[PDB]
Amino acid sequence: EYPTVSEIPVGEVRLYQIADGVWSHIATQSFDGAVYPSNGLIVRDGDELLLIDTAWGAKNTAALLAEIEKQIGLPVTRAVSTHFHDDRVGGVDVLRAAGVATYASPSTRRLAEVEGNEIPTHSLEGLSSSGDAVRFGPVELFYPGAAHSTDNLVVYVPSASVLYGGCAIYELSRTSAGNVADADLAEWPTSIERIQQHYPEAQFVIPGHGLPGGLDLLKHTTNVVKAHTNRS
Numbered sequence: 001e002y003p004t005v006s007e008i009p010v011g012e013v014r015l016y017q018i019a020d021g022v023w024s025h026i027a028t029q030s031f032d033g034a035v036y037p038s039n040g041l042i043v044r045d046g047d048e049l050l051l052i053d054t055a056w057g058a059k060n061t062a063a064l065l066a067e068i069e070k071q072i073g074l075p076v077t078r079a080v081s082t083h084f085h086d087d088r089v090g091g092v093d094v095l096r097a098a099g100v101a102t103y104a105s106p107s108t109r110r111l112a113e114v115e116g117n118e119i120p121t122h123s124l125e126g127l128s129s130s131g132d133a134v135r136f137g138p139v140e141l142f143y144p145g146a147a148h149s150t151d152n153l154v155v156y157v158p159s160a161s162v163l164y165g166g167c168a169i170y171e172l173s174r175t176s177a178g179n180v181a182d183a184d185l186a187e188w189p190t191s192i193e194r195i196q197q198h199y200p201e202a203q204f205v206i207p208g209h210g211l212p213g214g215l216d217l218l219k220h221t222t223n224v225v226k227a228h229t230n231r232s
């Protein structure tokens, strides 16, 4: 049902309807000689769409917009990137050219600039302290604290009980840590506990990469992070 790495050539994007007015988008990218799947989110709000994250590069993000037009047919008017890595902001220039208003926290914008990654134009205020939440159209944005990166945001869709954990949450199939070069390993389990405490009602949990599940993904991620922490 849910699209996998095997079934998506790099350059194509799949949409997966989760609920009324809520989709994930799934793309793949080559990196260091392997191929990785990647998720984002699409959320309807009236007669327009809110996009969560790019499809990991310009080419994929072009295909994303085309696939949205084909399968949904409503305009993307705002986008939020949930941290500064290229699987979240790579393609922001494509979005902007298409008239999308692109957003990220000041921390994400600052880190993207440092990294040399594309910089969302608008700033999300009210998210700089762990446990901060703000409304953004049909979703709530939440800063759980440092985890996969110091700037990582999570996204909740109240009407659908959909929790988008982004890359701070791992799919169950991943039993080893991925890119933790920018991670706060020491804080990551505590940040995951904040997510659990704030969104215990979540029914559909979407990781940044791979298969969705339920709130168990949180404990799973903590397990994997703690096991990496204990590198021997």
Ligand SMILES: CCOP(=O)(OCC)[C@@H](CS)CCCc1ccccc1
Residues within 6 Å of the ligand: 031, 032, 036, 037, 085, 086, 087, 167, 174, 178, 179, 208, 209
């Ligand atoms: C292997 C390179 O991972 P990235 O640093 O890609 C550069 C943008 C990471 C940013 S979150 C995305 C890929 C994470 C992943 C690792 C292993 C399996 C599935 C996804």
Ligand SMILES: [Zn+2]
Residues within 6 Å of the ligand: 083, 085, 148, 149, 167, 179
């Ligand atoms: Zn990342």
Ligand SMILES: [Zn+2]
Residues within 6 Å of the ligand: 085, 087, 167, 208, 209
């Ligand atoms: Zn990622």
Ligand SMILES: [Zn+2]
Residues within 6 Å of the ligand: 172, 219, 220, 221, 223
């Ligand atoms: Zn596990």
